[PDB]
Design a protein around this ligand. Structure first.
Ligand SMILES: Cc1cc2nc3c(=O)[nH]c(=O)nc-3n(C[C@H](O)[C@H](O)[C@H](O)CO)c2cc1C
Length: 184
């Protein structure tokens, strides 16, 4: 499993629509690109996916098993995805560790940037699914962080603002769909 610390951003270059599957070609930054190969299983927006092909800096994935419980179906060419390759020589996670099994999609209710914090409010739909506890960490697009507060069906996560920079958290707006991994 994975730390839930995003190591870089990919940009979707190509999408093949195959109805109950899609193939996404993602441009990878050079440091992550050279750390992966065919058959690498890594997190893309917090979801475990297997590399099917690499051509130049474009890394390809098929989304099939994951197509009904993640955002991939509705993403577009040019969108930015979070990337995380498994730890090289191990880790103690303990433990916002992520497994890569996304529980389902949720939707950004509100964002506020203040006081060096990115405050994200995420509305949890009723049929997701189990948990969610304010003492626990949660994965949002592969970023693992403690929950700040839960009010009704809205979870408030108060991120340091520089994760606005190093992950796609800073592309989120009201109505953005996200992959949630509850923990657990
Ligand atoms: C080893 C492993 C590899 C996986 N590879 C894929 C993949 O390439 N495509 C896919 O749609 N789901 C894949 N999944 C399943 C996916 O992570 C899971 O359906 C979603 O997280 C559910 O929301 C994989 C899961 C595991 C454990």
């Amino acid at each position: 499993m994975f730390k839930g610390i995003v190591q870089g951003a990919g940009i979707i270059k190509k999408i093949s629509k195959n109805d109950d599957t899609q193939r996404h070609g993602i441009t990878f930054p050079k440091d992550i690109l050279e750390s992966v190969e065919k058959g690498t299983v890594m997190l893309v927006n917090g979801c475990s996916l297997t590399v099917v092909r690499i051509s130049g800096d474009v890394v390809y994935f098929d989304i099939d098993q994951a197509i009904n419980t993640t955002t991939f179906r509705e993403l577009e060419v040019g969108n930015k995805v979070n990337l995380e390759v498994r730890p090289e020589f191990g880790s103690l996670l303990g433990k916002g560790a992520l497994t890569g099994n996304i529980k389902g999609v949720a939707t950004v209710d509100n964002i506020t940037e203040e006081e060096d914090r990115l405050k994200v409010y995420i509305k949890i739909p009723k049929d997701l699914i189990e948990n969610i506890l304010s003492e626990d960490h949660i994965g949002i697009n592969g970023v693992s962080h403690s929950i700040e507060e839960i009010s009704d069906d809205i979870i408030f996560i108060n991120y340091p603002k520089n994760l606005s920079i190093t992950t796609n958290l800073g592309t989120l707006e009201k109505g953005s769909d996200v992959n949630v991994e509850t923990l657990n």
